[PDB]
Paper text:
The membrane domain of the mycobacterial ATP synthase is embedded in the IPM, with the catalytic F1-domain of the enzyme extending into the bacterial cytoplasm and attached to the membrane domain by a central stalk and a peripheral stalk (PS). As do other ATP synthases in eubacteria, chloroplasts, and mitochondria, the enzyme couples a proton-motive force (pmf) across the IPM generated by respiration to the synthesis in the F1-domain of the enzyme of ATP from adenosine diphosphate (ADP) and phosphate by a mechanical rotary mechanism. The mycobacterial rotor consists of a membrane-bound ring of nine c-subunits, attached to an elongated central stalk, made of single copies of the γ- and ε-subunits. The mycobacterial PS is made of two proteins, bδ and b′.
The turning of the asymmetrical rotor brings about a series of conformational changes in the three catalytic sites, which lie at three of the six interfaces between α- and β-subunits, leading sequentially to the binding of the substrates ADP and phosphate, the formation of ATP, and finally the release of ATP. As in all other F-ATPases, the F1 catalytic domain has threefold pseudosymmetry with each catalytic interface of the α- and β-subunits separated by 120°. Each nucleotide binding site in the three α-subunits and in subunit βTP is occupied by an ATP molecule with an accompanying Mg2+ ion, while the site in subunit βDP has ADP and an accompanying Mg2+ ion. The sixth nucleotide binding site in subunit βE contains an ADP molecule with neither accompanying Mg2+ nor phosphate. Similar to the prior study, the electron density maps for each of states S1 to S3 has density for both tethered and untethered forms, and hence those particle classes contain enzymes that are auto-inhibited and others that are not inhibited by this mechanism. In the tethered forms the mycobacterial-specific extensions of the α-subunit make contact with the γ-subunit. In the untethered forms, these regions are disordered in the reconstructions and are presumably freely moving in the adjacent aqueous environment.
Author numbering:
A (entry chain C): 30 to 521
B (entry chain D): 8 to 474
C (entry chain G): 3 to 35, 86 to 94, 258 to 304
D (entry chain B): 29 to 137
E (entry chain F): 7 to 474
F (entry chain A): 275 to 411
G (entry chain B): 275 to 406
The structure:
């Protein structure tokens, strides 16, 4: 069966014939071009061209592969950059594919899963303590441009370095980074950041730069999802980042409009929500009978003018297992990461944290939300009561504590100790302006003199009573020698 | 006498039949996908009669792999689901297939998911209060036994946590059957609910029907009808009280709007299907208690973009006896449950039913909160000190009241690490009456945050040092 | 969302306007007979008159913005409706 | 000569069948001294935007070519005169001695 | 035979029917003749779509006025090509490659197609070398990248063109490589002024000008950028030069694309823009990149419709830029020049790993102070600075002084005020803004900081106002 | 409002051209035709009458929406009910400041007209003086 | 502005999809190709010139609307008359801060330049000073 291109243009084609073509089938156009059949009617077949559509012409012969969209999958994809078809684009040679995997495969059923119970440490105090991410969770990194979303995702990928070095498949996390509509040099810089941190040893990049046709930008998240799913169904743990899904939505809208499907809100196709939802429901925590593997999703959404009420941001927020709002106003204030505490949450909750972090950070998010509310309320108070003053001081110290620079991941034990400092009142004596330094210094002290606390937390996942008392004693002893910038003693 | 596929555009399939064999509207048709990696049996619901013996149908399963001109078999009846006590304790999809035990229930009686609502004569209003144990719900939004309850709110304000809390507080001790309908929600949430019900031994009395958000629009539109059919069988045949939980009802409307344009309908306002209110009315009027037969329906209603003026929640509002609107502002202030006391309502919150004292206390609380809301901006700009002494006293009272309306819920233990608490109605009324009289103005407002009753208030106050 | 925020800001500014006008009149009465004084520390009647005038200007600007957003929302809604209708034409 | 026929007309627009040699932006005469500009040319008909009294345009009317591409008279005679966008005097002071005709869509320097 | 004929003419878009088997390839250049005396010319059409039944839809590069149905259309066999080589330097060309200041020039040069694929991913290298312009605001808060992509956003009449001229004066003059200036949908008189100014400054001999201006059909307005990019790409790839590429204005390319899409019958996306907006922008931008070992330092002005930074065009353009400088109407109203929005503007190399710890610290302190000032502005508009706390009053004074000091007297601003511009070294800028943040200059009047250079000019103007 | 929504659904399903808020071009005609049948017949026709009490449900107190605007234009007077007054304790929550009856005193008995004459002035003046409740002195 | 309204009417009657404020996508092309023909010809072409004085009606002094911004981006400066000054009695009601002449500095006799160069920004600042 050979069809004939009856028309072409703008990355779309209409082909007559091929009566036995399947929906979403992969068609071959002359010159090695590939298309995907989306619209099927008696008149013709509508196809989206996946690349170099300038070579398509009326009357060309089109063959049907007989296979729906699928991509190669295997461990050989680690450390490689590929296009949404799995073809390498880093110029390093062929990739040995273990097997093939269709892009449209149903997500694990409600009975094939188990509750998310394993932490996925991002190394970032704010996320790990306030909006924890478990393995099998979908956490949305949403915010304006230049708010640090890619920074958060790249730091999360880098923080898996130690887990990868452990060598235990139950601990290792394999990373897939899908870049959609990104400038090529930005993808190159991301790859450089992963390589300098030795993260490409266990990372695959699916790249659909803005130069690519809308088909590649629409498919790239599904290609990455299939590549991650191959590992997930083999007992591995996968973390997948989509940067961004709004670019996917734009590309899909372009494809749908060119195919002349009736649009809806903001000219988007009626099934854009279905697109994103069925993409993101494949990130799951499989049951023990299926190997116990998981895929953790980190979709990234860019909001224009902090408008989270737009169509795609609203859909993606409603889809994921929690969101991590980043605000430019918070970013400029020095709150880095600029996570808006009141609106950011994780629906997995404490189940995604270790016991020690759960105990230290039990009510941190609520405490900070209430602190922000009180700070807004008491903006122009002429004489505050004692309880309000204490709450404001504690909240300011906590806000200072949650600040963190870029490319500076913290081990789970160090984060536990820092949050213990913050929430147990040991920072009340320290001036706000010094809190950060104090925190860091104390960690180093515990690293060089009382490392047994870190080892105990890391091996037992719990802060024992004896360990807690020793930590308090060490905190006070360090306070004795600590030098505050203002000169005030931080003892008692 | 079988048809064949003519057009395929996503979840909408056109099928041509021989003259005289055109299926009736809503009939279930069967088509085969033979592709090795995606072999399956599509179930198609006849949606439109296009003429020339063509019918437009919605696919319940994904259409990837479907081929034009393939055999399409007419079953002669609408989508049917199993009914009977055997459904209790099992998980089904929109088509009635059992998930926890494939092939189970294939021998039970099967009821068509499309049904008419009860006759107006049989309908009879319900006014009995349903005590939950949450201060805000019991006081300002009393729930009706056998009535219709909704939990409105945007994304991530606490609708699902509140649904789980109400399952814990109502279904656990329920003396009848329960039906949960997970309409277009997260699969992880469905698994969590299944495991939770199994742990609490309440699954044996509960029938679960799940259609997830990764399924085509057809399943999301018809899963609610399937669950409602099971609930209707329990109400009408078994004649026992039924608990019906739906989460999220808005997903039904959203799926309806997804295929609207693909069905040839011109879009209405806000890109909604023109038949929004008609479909909503059919589905919601099938959810009701008849004379002598009680269904207590609790529905989580998603409010798109926190916009309560959106046509979907606006249309939904008219179908409810009690509404609890969760607010993004209350949620961001750290108040949980994030109920907006000023926007909530209950048809039984009048003196005739709840009594004079309850009504008086609720109205005083509402008035104080409204005045505090009015003074919010003046406080924000000019500061509190510029208010009158009475206004300052009211502001302090309102802050304490809004903190006290918060509570530590049992279903929220995994989020705060704090065990939940339950407050009897009389204690709630007494405590809020004391609050509106300024009996606790000396205590810090922080003492009123995420506690239970007055004993917990005293414990927290003495923990903070107050008395 | 922008329209709702603009309406909220308009009501906020209105309340500010009434409270400032009341303060101005009370200050006038007291003259005839706290920090809301304009620049005494760096008079209250002058400061409150200025604040009320600024609130009036802010209310007018916010109302203009809200009307612009209302017209834009109507136009965009009609654009989407007619685009769908034309697609189905 | 070339003559077309109005095939439909409404709200300031007309469609004329025939006129195979019509130019783009050409001026067409409809009966009663009405004028139109041919914006859309296709194998079926020509879409003309009417300039003036559109209520005098009827289906079946005979439409004639002018041979000019949307031009107007130009010359020193226009000083002290009031004209409509077509260059026709409306002050009621008689004809205007136009030096020549200039096309409206000539490129800028 | 093999030549098609016109069947439909709807504005710049023309449908041409060809004999079976002779249908031209997409983007091929066809030729048609308009013979009417006033409008006589040779239309160059670009094949845009294949409509089927041997029909093709093409975009006209010249106004189609006077074109007749059924006239002969001849296929050139190739897409639009423009001259390349050192010869192009010092001459003015249009989108089609025709020399305007010397007609017939370049017909003998090598000709390159204006449609090309972007460089392969393996050939791309991130760039992080700072480009010292000499402006305080740019150097401090959004340093430019050498070999990177810089954009200037802003509404109508905020200083996009004046800032482009300023950067041409500060970068192109002392430049050992080649420059290409692409006027895209801009004022023709602005193009003439740029031509004259580059001739006077002696920079023209090293610069190639390509002008498709406001009074052109949308096809030309959307293809002139591709022509200039082709010239720049030849200079980058073949001659191994360091190429400066100035584009004004890219939003005009997007808007011309929108007009063409409407004329092509495509269904419109949000705000009536073309469905392929992001894809066309991606192609054009990704062609402008710098490859490994070969540097193109591009600088594009982006018009923001109705001062709406949420508009789809700039919204999509944002992702293609290493450095972004957003010009604000609010800043312009205060008379601050350049009318840069320090909070909105950004740069990818403003991190301590590239610009050093001191520069990053000073920039972040300035940004924090300005953000706090912006947050307070809402109470301030109602109640002056009088109700703020002492810390807030001090911060507001510091922020006002900082925002005045971010303004500068620019070289290109002399024609508007007669005041010669000033250049501030990066070290002096960092020192001065560190002093400002530390509060050392809080005693000087605000006007002392308005439109000056470094610390010496600050002292001179403070003396002129009777201050320390 | 629900009748208008149902008629809009009918019209859209019939492929009739939509206008503002997707309503057809004769929705105002629908409501005006409905509400102009409520009249006060002359004595020659028996002197009967029908009084109309249409209800309109606004969203976010937006009386400038399409159907509310149409119905407000059609009717002889409006009673605006506000949830803010309702929560304040004012029940029925009729906003006397904006609610108007164009028929006016002609629809009142003499005693009601006499007693209620000063009520409007007093309420308007009270609304003016509201802000000074804190400074009775 | 009225030409833009008429062209929008014509385009909508042609069923051309509109964009911002229901205007077509080529309204900017309309105004820009109109105003690009007001030029100062070179001495080769005779040295003649055409001076354009397009008028635009804003709504509530909103110079940030679509058509006003388009024309501002087309023309060489604007003379913004604001209703506030006009009503106060200041006529002509030129808004000093907004009004500007991009290519007007050269086209001015020596004396006028020498006298008014300061005056311009002096009044521009004295507006702000009088704000207090
Ligand atoms: N925690 C942090 N501390 C300091 N700087 C940070 C931090 N996170 C991000 N940044 C900086 O903020 C800028 C934006 O970072 P990033 O690229 O991650 O943001 P984004 O939101 O993904 O941006 P875009 O819209 O360009 O994709 C970069 O300069 C990055 O170095
Ligand atoms: N640094 C400056 N000093 C003084 N005046 C300036 C300065 N920058 C701009 N202007 C004034 O602003 C006017 C507009 O500047 P410019 O033409 O560069 O803006 P633009 O953003 O390119 O505008 P448009 O959208 O109209 O093309 C200039 O003609 C000049 O009047
Ligand atoms: N009682 C509560 N205490 C603390 N957090 C809560 C409570 N209820 C809800 N939340 C938070 O609200 C978020 C959303 O919860 P959920 O109801 O599952 O989503 P939705 O409201 O969209 O249905 C969760 O991440 C949870 O942390
Ligand atoms: Mg990013
Ligand atoms: Mg939920
Ligand atoms: Mg300019």
């Amino acid at each position: 069966e050979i069809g004939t291109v009856i028309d072409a243009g703008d990355g779309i084609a209409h082909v007559e014939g091929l009566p036995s073509v399947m929906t979403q089938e992969l068609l071959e156009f002359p010159g090695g071009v590939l298309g995907v059949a989306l619209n099927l009617d008696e008149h013709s077949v509508g196809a989206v061209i996946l690349g170099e559509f300038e070579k398509i012409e009326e009357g060309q012969q089109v063959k049907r592969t007989g296979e729906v969209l699928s991509v190669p999958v295997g461990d050989a994809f680690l450390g490689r950059v590929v296009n949404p078809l799995g073809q390498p684009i880093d110029g390093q040679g062929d990739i040995a594919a273990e097997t093939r995997r269709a892009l449209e495969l149903q997500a694990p059923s409600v009975v094939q899963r188990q509750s998310v119970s394993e932490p996925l440490q991002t190394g970032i105090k704010a996320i790990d303590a306030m909006t924890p991410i478990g393995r099998g969770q979908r956490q949305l990194i949403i915010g304006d441009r230049k708010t640090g979303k890619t920074a958060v995702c790249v730091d999360t990928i880098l923080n898996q370095r130690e887990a990868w070095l452990t060598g235990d498949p139950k601990q290792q996390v394999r990373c897939v980074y899908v870049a959609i509509g990104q400038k090529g040099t930005t993808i190159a810089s991301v790859k450089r950041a992963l390589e300098e941190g030795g993260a490409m040893e266990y990372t695959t990049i699916v790249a659909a730069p803005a130069s690519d046709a809308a088909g590649f930008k629409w498919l790239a998240p599904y290609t990455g999802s299939a590549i991650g799913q191959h590992w997930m169904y083999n007992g591995k743990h996968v973390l997948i980042v989509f940067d961004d899904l709004s670019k996917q939505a734009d590309a899909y809208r372009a494809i749908s409009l060119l195919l002349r499907r009736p649009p809806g809100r903001e000219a988007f196709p009626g099934d854009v929500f279905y697109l994103h939802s069925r993409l993101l429901e494949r990130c799951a925590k499989l049951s023990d009978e299926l190997g116990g593997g998981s895929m953790t999703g980190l979709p990234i959404i860019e909001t224009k003018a902090n408008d989270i009420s737009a169509f795609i941001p609203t859909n993606v927020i409603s889809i994921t297992d929690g969101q991590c709002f980043l605000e430019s106003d918070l970013f400029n204030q020095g709150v880095r990461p600029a996570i808006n505490v009141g609106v950011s949450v994780s629906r997995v909750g404490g189940a995604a944290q270790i016991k020690a972090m759960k105990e230290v950070a039990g009510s941190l998010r609520l405490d900070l939300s209430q602190y922000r509310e009180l700070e807004a309320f008491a903006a122009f108070a002429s004489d505050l009561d004692a309880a309000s003053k204490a709450q404001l001081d504690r909240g300011a110290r906590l806000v200072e504590l949650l600040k963190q620079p870029q490319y500076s991941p913290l081990a789970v034990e160090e984060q536990v100790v820092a949050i213990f400092l913050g929430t147990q009142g040991h920072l009340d004596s320290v001036p706000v302006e010094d809190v950060q330094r104090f925190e860091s210094e104390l960690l180093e002290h515990v690293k060089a003199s009382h490392s047994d606390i870190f080892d105990g937390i890391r091996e037992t996942k719990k802060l024992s009573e004896e360990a807690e008392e020793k930590l308090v004693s060490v905190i006070n002893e360090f306070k004795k020698g600590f030098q505050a910038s203002d000169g005030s003693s931080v003892v008692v | 006498t079988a048809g064949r596929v003519v057009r395929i555009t996503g979840p909408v399939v056109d099928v041509e039949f021989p003259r005289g064999s055109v299926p009736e509207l809503f009939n279930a048709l069967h088509a085969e996908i033979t592709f090795g990696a995606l072999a399956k049996t599509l179930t198609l619901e006849v949606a439109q009669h296009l003429g020339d013996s063509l019918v437009r149908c919605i696919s319940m399963q994904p259409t990837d792999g479907l081929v034009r001109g393939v055999e399409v078999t007419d079953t002669g009846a609408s989508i049917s689901v199993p009914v009977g006590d055997g459904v209790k304790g099992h998980v089904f999809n929109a088509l009635g297939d059992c998930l926890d035990d494939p092939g189970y229930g294939k021998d039970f009686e099967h009821w068509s998911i499309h049904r008419k609502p009860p006759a107006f004569s049989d309908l009879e209003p319900r006014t009995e209060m349903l005590e939950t144990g949450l201060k805000v719900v019991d006081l300002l939004t009393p729930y009706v036994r056998g009535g219709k309850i909704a939990l409105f709110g945007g994304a991530g304000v606490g609708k699902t946590v509140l649904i789980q809390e109400m399952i814990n507080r109502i279904a656990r001790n329920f003396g009848g059957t329960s039906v949960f309908a997970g309409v277009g929600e997260r699969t992880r949430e469905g698994n969590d609910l299944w495991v939770e019900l199994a742990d609490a031994n309440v699954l044996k009395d509960t029938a679960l029907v799940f259609g997830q958000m990764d399924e085509p629009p057809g399943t999301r539109m018809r899963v609610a009808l399937s669950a409602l059919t099971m609930a209707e069988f329990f109400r009408d045949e078994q004649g026992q009280d039924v608990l019906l939980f739906i989460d999220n009802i808005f997903r039904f409307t959203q799926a309806g709007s997804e295929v609207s344009t693909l069905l040839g309908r011109m879009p209405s306002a806000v890109g909604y299907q023109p038949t929004l209110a008609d479909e909503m009315g059919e589905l919601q009027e099938r959810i009701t208690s008849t004379r002598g037969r009680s269904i207590t329906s609790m529905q989580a209603v998603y409010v798109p973009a926190d916009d309560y003026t959106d046509p979907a929640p606006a249309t939904t509002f008219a179908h409810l006896d009690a509404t609890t609107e969760l607010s993004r502002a209350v949620f961001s202030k750290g108040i949980f449950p994030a109920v907006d006391p000023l926007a909530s309502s209950s048809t039984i919150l009048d003196p005739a039913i709840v009594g004079d004292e309850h009504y008086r206390v609720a109205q005083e609380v509402i008035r104080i909160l409204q005045r505090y809301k009015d003074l919010q901006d003046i406080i924000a700009i000019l500061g509190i000190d510029e208010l009158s002494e009475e206004d300052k006293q009211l502001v302090n009272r309102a802050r304490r009241i809004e903190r006290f309306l918060s509570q530590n819920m049992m279903a929220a233990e995994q989020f705060t690490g704090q065990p939940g608490s339950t407050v009897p109605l009389k204690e709630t009324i007494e405590a809020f009456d004391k609050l509106t009289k300024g009996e606790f103005d000396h205590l810090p407002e922080q003492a009123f945050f995420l506690i239970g009753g007055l004993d917990d208030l005293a414990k927290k106050a003495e923990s903070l040092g107050a008395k | 969302a922008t329209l709702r925020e603009l309406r909220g800001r308009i009501r906020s500014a209105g309340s500010i306007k009434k409270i400032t006008k009341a303060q101005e009149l009370i200050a006038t009465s007291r003259i005839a007979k706290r920090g809301l004084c304009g620049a005494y520390n760096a008079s209250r009647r002058r400061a409150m008159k200025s604040a009320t005038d600024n609130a009036d200007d802010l209310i007018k600007a916010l109302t203009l913005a809200a009307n612009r957003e209302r017209q834009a929302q109507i136009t965009q809604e009609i654009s989407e409706i007619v685009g769908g209708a034309n697609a189905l034409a | 000569e070339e003559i077309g026929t109005v095939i439909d007309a409404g709200d300031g627009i007309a469609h004329v069948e025939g006129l195979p040699s019509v130019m783009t932006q050409e001026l067409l005469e409809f009966p009663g001294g009405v004028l139109g500009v041919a914006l859309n040319l296709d194998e079926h008909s020509v879409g003309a935007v009417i300039l003036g009294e559109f209520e005098k345009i009827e289906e079946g009317q005979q439409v004639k070519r002018t041979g000019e591409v949307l031009s107007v008279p130009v010359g020193d005679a226009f000083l002290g005169r009031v004209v409509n966008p077509l260059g026709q005097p409306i002050d009621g002071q008689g004809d205007i001695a136009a030096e020549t005709r200039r096309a409206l869509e000539l490129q800028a320097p």
